[PDB]
Design a protein around this ligand. Structure first.
Ligand SMILES: Nc1ncnc2c1ncn2[C@@H]1O[C@H](CSCC[C@H](N)C(=O)O)[C@@H](O)[C@H]1O
Length: 320
């Protein structure tokens, strides 16, 4: 009977939508994605066969938003403004990349005839401490919202990937039940690997000899993979782990040259896509898009696995 109509702000490649669709909420829903990134939109449209609204969220009018007649807000705002450097200088609140998310809560939400009955926000841990969210929290509270938040990682529910993120769950009804995480069907890094990767993905020997020791290396059996970020395969450190197909448990070495013969390679875009929990039919392999472009979008996406469970909680007032 009841329906879920979502405005997918900062839709990107449709991580928030994917999360909902794979969850057990099982209420048919509609999605209206907003994003100015042409490449990201192309992937979204390719997979969801729906057009992305490119209206800039910095200045979008209340009227246009309300014309959508939606009752749900999904969003993962730009995360750049939220590091210790910017935040310790109190510059996050004035950061132009935060202008869109402040606009939505300052200028839109408090004036809607029908406030969204459910709101889901995803961002980096430091967002929780930002002046931006501090204000958003106050606004939500003043507008009669109940708010539950959590900082967690996919590994917490048995997914072999470290991506610690901050999640905000807001709605107009109080939460009767304690939030709960369930362990996902057991899986290893093995389960996400493509089985015939082109050699164009293996780490060049010259790169190995110069920065090989900086890589976080994993085998098909190792505990987890590191957080995949935008610049994966471009910048060595902190952008994601690489894979060794020779050892179930990568055994560390002392010299870079010792890595030369372990057939090291980057994870493919399709592999990251599977690790982030997108549907088997979902693909960033849009015609014309290079691996870099796909890596960038994927690096900026989400863990559909985690969000699926948190959304089921957010919407637990729609059952029984
Ligand atoms: N003023 C603005 N209007 C619309 N989108 C914006 C924007 N400023 C930044 N963005 C978008 O917000 C997105 C943040 S990344 C989030 C991606 C999404 N969660 C996914 O699963 O892929 C970026 O793609 C960026 O294009």
């Amino acid at each position: 009977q009841k329906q879920v109509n979502v405005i997918e702000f900062f839709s990107g490649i449709g991580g928030l939508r994917s999360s909902y669709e794979r969850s057990s909420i099982n209420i048919n829903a509609t999605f209206i994605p907003f994003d100015i990134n042409e490449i990201a939109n192309k992937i979204y449209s390719k997979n969801f066969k729906e057009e992305v609204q490119v209206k800039n969220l910095d200045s979008i009018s209340i009227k246009q938003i309300e014309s959508l007649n939606c009752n749900t807000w999904f969003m993962s705002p730009p995360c750049q403004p939220y590091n210790n450097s910017i935040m310790s200088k109190h510059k996050d609140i004035n950061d132009p990349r935060a202008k869109s998310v402040l606009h939505l809560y300052r200028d839109i939400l408090p004036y809607l005839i029908n406030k969204p009955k459910h709101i889901f926000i995803e961002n980096v841990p430091l967002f929780k401490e930002s002046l931006v969210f501090k204000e958003i929290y106050n606004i939500l509270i003043k507008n009669q919202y109940y708010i539950k938040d959590i900082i967690c990682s996919p590994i917490d529910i048995g997914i072999p990937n470290s991506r610690t993120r901050y999640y905000v769950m807001a709605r107009l009804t109080p939460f009767k039940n304690e939030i709960q995480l369930h362990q996902e069907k057991e899986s290893m890094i093995s389960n996400y690997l493509d089985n015939n990767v082109n050699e164009s993905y293996s780490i060049p020997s010259d790169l190995i000899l110069k920065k090989g020791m900086l890589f976080d290396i994993v085998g098909k059996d190792d505990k987890r993979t590191c957080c995949f970020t935008k610049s994966y395969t471009k910048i060595v450190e902190g952008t994601g782990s690489i894979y060794c197909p020779i050892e179930p448990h990568f055994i560390p070495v002392k010299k870079a040259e010792d890595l030369l013969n372990k057939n090291l390679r980057y994870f493919t875009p399709n592999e990251i896509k599977k690790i982030h929990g997108f549907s088997s039919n979902f693909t960033t392999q849009i015609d014309g898009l290079t691996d870099k472009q796909q890596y960038q979008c994927l690096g900026n996406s989400v863990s559909c696995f985690v969000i699926a469970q948190l959304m089921e909680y957010l919407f637990d007032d729609l059952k029984e």
